[model samples]
Target: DSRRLSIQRAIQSLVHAAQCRNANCSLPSCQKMKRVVQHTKGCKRKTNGGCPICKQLIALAAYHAKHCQENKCPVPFCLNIKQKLRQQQLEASIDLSAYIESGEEQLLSDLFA
Candidate 1:
């Protein structure tokens, strides 16, 4: 029970820290960015299963990298614009453009008729 309390305390601290960082940081897609920050911070505590100082440090570092910097860019802790763009490209490559393409003229013609 004591160990569980300690884990919770560590998590609370990490979350507070992350929130503090997020407040100061201007993230692109701020809503999603805030969720990412909170999720990663919560995951840091949940995944550790123990209140290891090293793990706490790692979480702090990640939060800092994501929120704290001169550039004021969104944290690089996870998929940033470059990664998202790459993933979007991959998805776009497999996109079924035919459905919209095939329906456009027919739909317009039907409307006119």
Candidate 2:
């Protein structure tokens, strides 16, 4: 829990820096660019295919957000957060064999408990 909180704090800080840097660019303009990309038939039909310039701008925005010294960008930061969460969950789910003896008594106790 403490680890997760620390990571969350770091992510928030990164996003704040991005916001302060205005790394996201103009939202209205970005929305227009996204709309234009969305309306394109090729981009809609093809995987990983979109308006080149729009894609470039979006990538740039993400990079800026991720690397922003002052604030964190939500998109990339969220991705990192998700990955960390999954890793933590996986670690929790792994079997604990070394500390526990495998015996009928232990098995029954575990089941009843």
Candidate 3:
């Protein structure tokens, strides 16, 4: 699927960002990613409250989680990002499950009525 392409690109983005940080190569894109990686340090918030351009780091960190399977990976706060993503899915499912639980009671009442 074409969506797979986005995954690969994210891996590429993560890789380039990693390269920039580790290899000390300097490209315009690397610089852009570099700043975001730096921002992750001492900036603790799952939600974005940064400059619009600065906010891209959150998603970039997310991409690191998606592409990274390594434990305590090199990408900044990638493990933190991984858990935050899990927390998001967990919260989403909790809401859905809570709704379904209510719906089930509604169904039983409807049948009884």
**Candidate closest to the true structure, highest TM-score:** 3
Winner by lDDT: 3
Q: What clash pairs does model 1 have?
A: 66-75
**TM-score list, all predictions:** 0.24, 0.27, 0.54
- lDDT scores in order: 0.50, 0.48, 0.68
Worst 10 residues of 1 by lDDT: 70-79
Higher-scoring candidate on TM-score, 1 or 2 = 2
**Model 1 lDDT per residue over 31-104, tens place:** 44355555555564543566454344445444444434334333334224344545777788657564457687
Instruction: Look at candidate 2 and give me any clashing residue pairs.
Output: 14-71, 14-72, 15-71, 15-72, 16-71, 16-72, 17-70, 17-71, 18-71
- Write candidate 2's Cα lDDT for 20-56 as tens digits: 4354555554444444434432444332654565454
Candidate 3 segments whose C-alpha is farther than 4 A from its true place: 1-11, 19-32, 39-49, 103-113
Question: How would you encode candidate 3's per-residue C-alpha lDDT over 4-65 as one tens digit per residue?
Answer: 68766655766677755355565666766676666656565634564544456656667668
| Candidate 1 whole-model C-alpha lDDT, 0 to 1 | 0.50
CA deviation > 4 Å runs, candidate 1: 21-53, 56-113
Q: How many backbone clashes does candidate 3 have?
A: 0
TM-score ranking from best candidate downward: 3, 2, 1
TM-score of model 1 vs. true structure: 0.24
